[PDB]
RNA sequence: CACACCCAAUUGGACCAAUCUAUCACCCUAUAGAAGAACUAAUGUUAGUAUAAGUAACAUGAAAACAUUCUCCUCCGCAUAAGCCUGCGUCAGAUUAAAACACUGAACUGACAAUUAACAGCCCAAUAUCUACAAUCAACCAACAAGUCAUUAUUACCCUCACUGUCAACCCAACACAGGCAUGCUCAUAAGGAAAGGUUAAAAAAAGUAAAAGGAACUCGGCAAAUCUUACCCCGCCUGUUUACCAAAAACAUCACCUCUAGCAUCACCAGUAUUAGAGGCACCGCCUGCUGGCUCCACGAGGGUUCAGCUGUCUCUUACUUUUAACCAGUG
RNA sequence: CUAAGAACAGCUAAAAGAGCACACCCGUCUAUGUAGCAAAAUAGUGGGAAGAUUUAUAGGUAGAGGCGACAAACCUACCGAGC
RNA sequence: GCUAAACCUAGCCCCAAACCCACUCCACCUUACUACCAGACAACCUUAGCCAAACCAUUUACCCAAAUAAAGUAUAGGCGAUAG
């Protein structure tokens, strides 16, 4: 037994770290953890995003219907004044309707050749359950959200996120809130292809319909490049020819896959969603 | 000759856990039709062989009480008899060995 | 010394929800201070690893090693314990999940050599650990085939990028 | 190189090999069923079969008496050979003994076997029995045999 | 090389404490009922007949 | 963009882990003081555990009713002495490593029991006084090395059988060690024992047996083995002695010879006296020689060489079989 | 070295530090063994074996020494100077 | 998860203070721990050496009764090492 407290104390802390790794504790809300003030954390929320939020409106944006129902049940167990808290259902409807129309406005102006179904999918993707939740969890939205179950379900988190837009829409107006959608939702399709967000089936069948609307004859698929046909690792470049004019060329391991990819390349050029398209203009409006 | 270097555990595992060193699974095990205990196809049942030796020892103990000493082997056949039995027609002029016990079912009188 | 394996049988789980699937029964049993080499014991524990409870007994019954009789006695008392204490419906349903040997407390004696020399002989002891899980033994992993090899190889050729550039 | 060797190398030498088999043979005649290591039983089995052959020559044969005198250490068993074992196998021309394998002994896990003289008064061994003629495989072969014989007749 | 296991504990009796002791075990409850009670047969029917 | 931030020995600095103390501090800190104040290295010390390695090595004659019987060995056995000190008697044991085993498991633990004197040991009143003549069948004979056994007188004295040793599978060798161990009988046993755990019958290795034709052609050398065998030379006279654990000899000692010293007693020499004693050389004898030196020669030798004949696997030229080992299975390790 | 004891078949021979040859003592040659059964042993082959023999018991000589048929041997398993 | 790993006392060290112990019965210098017979036997005497002097040969510190100082001074010494 060697005299000394500092070494023994330091070893206990190391053991505690190992205990956490072996048996991690269940996750808890940031509110329950020490150094938390709901009034202070929500004031900084507006300043962090550089917006003139309304405290009364924003405090109602994080309140969920499930939270109110569970909170009332807590008082019944103790028999305990009435709460006038308002849920975010009213604000979420305002934000969701405005966001879809604002995204539709932005996408239709940027891509005039994109069909309405194509624009609908992109708005359904940017406002989708995964994109909204990914943006919400990195803006301290889940921390301020008053939910009944932790972690916040993705459906609950998506609805709370649009309530922040609804609170922002009333306080700052539509022009100011339009930049909020562009700076957080439009930037979510930067490194993404057209059909990676708008998943389609049989692009060749969709390509034939598009050329009928433009009075263009059906393309003829021909082999432009070929390599390793008899091997298990071939390379086929099939090209679509309209009136003996190449409109797109697609690669693939086999001929059917290459032709399907060639159709996807043709659709991207028609809709103007190619990789070569000019980037979204994030500069301040003039 | 002494080892030049210590052989590591990684080298040792490849030698110790090699499939040749491992015990080979036996596929010649089947259940005994008589008692249900396990046995091999080419080996007599251990349970059934033990019951024969237990009965054989008792029979051989009765032989010792009749001979009453060594170098007294009989020059006639031997017959083992149990309670409730009489010498047979062919069991004449033989040494009857009495057993105060019921005849075992697997032991067929011949 | 450590006796955690005994304590692994005393953990009680919360009652399962009606929609939750059936939880397999886990039985932890061991025998301590077996007068046997742990290295020799490992071959017997490796043999019955993953086998059924009845299949394991058959292999141990006709095995000539001394530990085969010792391990078989452990399996019989572990099979009895599962039905008697661990609420297992069928005793034969059990299969071997974990079966390993461990070093035990060993003695030290003197082995005399010639020329007045000597060596230190140890009386080796071992521990045997067995875990039983209720339910049929999992099917052995099928050997990797050409289609599995071809699919993996092409995936490697598809995941390669242009390195040391943009 | 051991090609054609039929005799095993046991005991402390060629003479000790004979004495080990002689003790087993003498113990086999007295008890008509003994248990011993499989190799020693198999090596002694040949001598057991030929001992009855000398026993059928009769006790009046001088040569047969000398073989019985040597191979039976206990002299009380010699009258038994010429008056019990030999008359028993009078109709038989071979297969006097049956050799069966038994579980290995716990002492040294040695391959053990039991050898007995047929027709003894001891309880029968649990002999290996083939599948009954009523089994599914035998019935298919039984039906095949009937058709082949019937077609052969016609 | 003369060290050996400390296997020296032996079985003993737990029924009775050491003899010639002033202290004796204090019992708070009796082992069994002093007089066995046998409820009349058919008392289950009487449960319905509360009167 | 940053910038003290790539030399041995040595030298100058700036920081500093942990500890104790003063005062703070109070999830482990501050400023100071003090000191057993920091280890990838000394064939370091102690302890744990690997590697070689589950390797080397170790063990139990057979059948059986576990009554008994069989096979084989016996160069051992029994007793006393000495030594050891309860160390295979009974019972029980959560028992459980004696180099395998083990339930009755047992050469382990605990308890209980035991070896009974006639044998052996433990002896004796005083004072004087006695005791030339071997032993060896002790009779012949023949010795030298000269030897292993005895009382009387007077006085005193007539109480009685205590005490201790007594077991065993045993002692000295670190061990249940192929060793060491006095005497009396048995001289093959009337007593005491078991070389093989099972299997297989590879190499290599050990021991043994047999071999065509040849018979030392092998080899430093007829070493080993076989056979039962002649003639010499060298050295040492001979028996004997020595380097316990690499040298048994030509070395040492040895009768015989020779040199030197000593004229005498109460502890060696010596209870002796120059035909003696001591210190030495040489190695008998015989011959020869000087006034000490050289040859010859009988036997003898696990000395060193040589040789006839025989003998033989030493070899030309190896081969077969058996046993141990071996390899595999089980236990220990 | 002292004291007082013991042992040595049989045969040939003769009153023998004679011969052959057991017990016994010694350790010539070869092989096995080399952390071995053994910090010097085993098997066979050998020298002596009535004597300067072998051996049990007790006592004596102690390290600037003892003892020694001198091998610089031995004096409790490292003696050119014990521990 | 086995083997293990951890622990705080037992006690000890250095001072102060004060000068310590040894007959219950029996046995104990003979072969100690042995009830019980003529002995005559009696104790005292410089330390050396390693080491230093770069060998070694003269020499080379070892509490002798008050801490300090005189003083490492007078002296001693192969007038060297060193001692005092
Ligand atoms: K000689
Ligand atoms: K010097
Ligand atoms: Mg020794
Ligand atoms: Mg063969
Ligand atoms: Mg710079
Ligand atoms: Mg500090
Ligand atoms: Mg230090
Ligand atoms: Mg360290
Ligand atoms: Mg070190
Ligand atoms: Mg090896
Ligand atoms: Mg071996
Ligand atoms: Mg044996
Ligand atoms: Mg007497
Ligand atoms: Mg006997
Ligand atoms: Mg063998
Ligand atoms: Mg063997
Ligand atoms: Mg020849
Ligand atoms: Mg030659
Ligand atoms: Mg020779
Ligand atoms: Mg001589
Ligand atoms: Mg002479
Ligand atoms: Mg001589
Ligand atoms: Mg020598
Ligand atoms: Mg000598
Ligand atoms: Mg020699
Ligand atoms: Mg001389
Ligand atoms: Mg020559
Ligand atoms: Mg010749
Ligand atoms: Mg041949
Ligand atoms: Mg093995
Ligand atoms: Mg003589
Ligand atoms: Mg002689
Ligand atoms: Mg001498
Ligand atoms: Mg000399
Ligand atoms: Mg010299
Ligand atoms: Mg010595
Ligand atoms: Mg000096
Ligand atoms: Mg010098
Ligand atoms: Zn059966």
UniProtKB/Swiss-Prot annotation, chain B:
Processing after translation: MRPL32 precursor is processed by the m-AAA protease (composed of AFG3L2 and SPG7), which cleaves the N-terminal transit peptide. Cleavage by the m-AAA protease takes place prior to assembly into the large subunit, an essential step for mitochondrial ribosome (mitoribosome) assembly. Proper processing by the m-AAA protease is dependent on the zinc-binding region within the tightly folded C-terminal domain of MRPL32: zinc-dependent folding halts degradation initiated from the N-terminus and triggers the release of mature MRPL32.
Assembly mode: Component of the mitochondrial large ribosomal subunit (mt-LSU). Mature mammalian 55S mitochondrial ribosomes consist of a small (28S) and a large (39S) subunit. The 28S small subunit contains a 12S ribosomal RNA (12S mt-rRNA) and 30 different proteins. The 39S large subunit contains a 16S rRNA (16S mt-rRNA), a copy of mitochondrial valine transfer RNA (mt-tRNA(Val)), which plays an integral structural role, and 52 different proteins. bL32m has a zinc binding site.
Subcellular location: Mitochondrion
Transmembrane parts of this sequence: none
Compositional bias (Basic and acidic residues): 91-103
Keywords, ordered alphabetically: Mitochondrion, Ribonucleoprotein, Ribosomal protein, Transit peptide
Source organism (scientific name): Homo sapiens (Human)
UniProt keyword Nucleotide-binding present: no
Any single GO CC term annotated in Swiss-Prot or TrEMBL for this entry: mitochondrial ribosome
Protein name as annotated: Large ribosomal subunit protein bL32m
Example GO BP: translation
Recorded superkingdom: Eukaryota
A GO molecular-function annotation: structural constituent of ribosome
Binding site for Zn(2+): 32, 35, 45, 48
Region annotation Disordered: where it falls in the sequence: 86-110
From Swiss-Prot, chain C:
Superkingdom of this protein's organism: Eukaryota
Subcellular locations according to the entry: Mitochondrion
Keyword Oxidoreductase included in the entry's annotation: no
Keywords assigned by UniProt, alphabetized: Mitochondrion, Ribonucleoprotein, Ribosomal protein, Transit peptide
One GO term of the biological process aspect: translation
Principal subcellular localisation of the protein: mitochondrion
GO molecular function (one): structural constituent of ribosome
Family membership noted in the UniProt record: Belongs to the universal ribosomal protein uL22 family.
Quaternary assembly: Component of the mitochondrial large ribosomal subunit (mt-LSU). Mature mammalian 55S mitochondrial ribosomes consist of a small (28S) and a large (39S) subunit. The 28S small subunit contains a 12S ribosomal RNA (12S mt-rRNA) and 30 different proteins. The 39S large subunit contains a 16S rRNA (16S mt-rRNA), a copy of mitochondrial valine transfer RNA (mt-tRNA(Val)), which plays an integral structural role, and 52 different proteins.
UniProt protein name: Large ribosomal subunit protein uL22m
UniProtKB/Swiss-Prot annotation, chain D:
Binding partners and assembly: Component of the mitochondrial large ribosomal subunit (mt-LSU). Mature mammalian 55S mitochondrial ribosomes consist of a small (28S) and a large (39S) subunit. The 28S small subunit contains a 12S ribosomal RNA (12S mt-rRNA) and 30 different proteins. The 39S large subunit contains a 16S rRNA (16S mt-rRNA), a copy of mitochondrial valine transfer RNA (mt-tRNA(Val)), which plays an integral structural role, and 52 different proteins.
Keywords linked to the UniProt accession: Mitochondrion, Ribonucleoprotein, Ribosomal protein, Transit peptide
GO molecular function list: protein domain specific binding; structural constituent of ribosome
Subcellular localization(s) per the UniProt record: Mitochondrion
Tissue: Detected in adrenal gland, mammary gland and adipose tissue.
GO CC term (a single one): mitochondrion
Ligase found in the keyword field: no
Similarity annotation: Belongs to the bacterial ribosomal protein bL17 family.
Name of the gene this protein is made from: MRPL17
PANTHER family noted in UniProt: LARGE RIBOSOMAL SUBUNIT PROTEIN BL17M, RIBOSOMAL PROTEIN L17
Organism of this sequence: Homo sapiens
Keyword Ribosomal protein part of the UniProt annotation: yes
One annotated GO biological process: mitochondrial translation
Protein name: Large ribosomal subunit protein bL17m
From Swiss-Prot, chain E:
Annotated transmembrane regions: none
Cellular compartment(s): Mitochondrion
Superkingdom in the source lineage: Eukaryota
Role played: Component of the mitochondrial large ribosomal subunit (mt-LSU). Within the mitochondrial ribosomes, required to direct the nascent polypeptide toward the tunnel exit and position the exit at a distance from the membrane surface.
Family: Belongs to the mitochondrion-specific ribosomal protein mL45 family.
Subunit and partners: Component of the mitochondrial large ribosomal subunit (mt-LSU). Mature mammalian 55S mitochondrial ribosomes consist of a small (28S) and a large (39S) subunit. The 28S small subunit contains a 12S ribosomal RNA (12S mt-rRNA) and 30 different proteins. The 39S large subunit contains a 16S rRNA (16S mt-rRNA), a copy of mitochondrial valine transfer RNA (mt-tRNA(Val)), which plays an integral structural role, and 52 different proteins.
Listed name of the protein: Large ribosomal subunit protein mL45
Organism: Homo sapiens (Human)
